[PDB]
Design an enzyme around this catalytic site. Structure first.
Site, PDB file in Angstrom:
ATOM      1  N   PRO B   1       0.809  -1.256   0.108  1.00  0.00           N
ATOM      2  CG  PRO B   1      -1.009  -1.614   1.569  1.00  0.00           C
ATOM      3  CD  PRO B   1       0.514  -1.792   1.302  1.00  0.00           C
TER       4      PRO B   1
HETATM    5  O1  LIG Z   1      -0.089  -3.676  -1.079  1.00  0.00           O
HETATM    6  C1  LIG Z   1      -1.205  -3.244  -1.872  1.00  0.00           C
HETATM    7  O2  LIG Z   1      -2.343  -3.678  -1.424  1.00  0.00           O
HETATM    8  C2  LIG Z   1      -0.679  -2.490  -2.769  1.00  0.00           C
HETATM    9  F1  LIG Z   1      -1.553  -1.362  -3.263  1.00  0.00           F
HETATM   10  C3  LIG Z   1       0.237  -2.421  -3.688  1.00  0.00           C
HETATM   11  C4  LIG Z   1       1.473  -3.474  -3.483  1.00  0.00           C
HETATM   12  C5  LIG Z   1       2.625  -3.405  -3.984  1.00  0.00           C
HETATM   13  C6  LIG Z   1       3.756  -4.141  -4.093  1.00  0.00           C
HETATM   14  C7  LIG Z   1       3.437  -5.584  -3.515  1.00  0.00           C
HETATM   15  O3  LIG Z   1       4.431  -6.478  -3.448  1.00  0.00           O
HETATM   16  C8  LIG Z   1       2.198  -5.673  -3.108  1.00  0.00           C
HETATM   17  C9  LIG Z   1       1.300  -4.948  -3.210  1.00  0.00           C
END
Ligand SMILES: O=C([O-])/C(F)=C\c1ccc(O)cc1
Ligand SMILES: O=C([O-])/C(F)=C\c1ccc(O)cc1
Lengths: 76, 76
Positions: B1
């Site tokens: 996130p």
């Molecule tokens: O965590 C999330 O819900 C996200 F929006 C992106 C993300 C970015 C890189 C990652 O490895 C996993 C999720």
């Protein structure tokens, strides 16, 4: 302060959103010397196919200033 | 996130920035079931005279959708 949280989609009901907001609020009060009344929080669920736009507009340009850098890279 | 924190200008040192990021990280891990590596956090200082633009773009149009609504208003 205004806090914006972007993440991939997940099932989150109103009790869960309120609990997330409460915990964010406590952190902001303690670290920024804020008041409950000044805090607003947005939660935006972004499909994974559209995460590149967040990287390009928000994450990558601010790498020099982020207080927490990502543990992945998506420069395209 | 990806978490974006917008606030009025404050003196924050490196230790303070890292502690704020770590407390936010653990809240996101708890509520979104995230891994540390997927979390990025930005802290953007906004001058008070430029807060109306934040209200108009990010708070007012999303009011109902916010997971925490402001206790103050810029449209009284
Ligand atoms: O965590 C999330 O819900 C996200 F929006 C992106 C993300 C970015 C890189 C990652 O490895 C996993 C999720
Ligand atoms: O909290 C902040 O640093 C901020 F960006 C705005 C704000 C909004 C309402 C208030 O009552 C105080 C500050």
């Amino acid at each position: 302060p205004h806090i914006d949280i972007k993440c991939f989609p997940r099932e989150l009901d109103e009790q869960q959103k309120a609990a997330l907001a409460a915990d964010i609020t406590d952190v902001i009060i303690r670290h920024l010397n804020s008041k409950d009344s000044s805090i607003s929080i947005a939660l935006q669920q972004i499909q994974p196919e559209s995460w590149q736009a967040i990287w390009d507009a928000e994450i990558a340009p601010q790498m020099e200033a982020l207080i927490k850098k990502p543990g992945y890279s998506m420069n395209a």
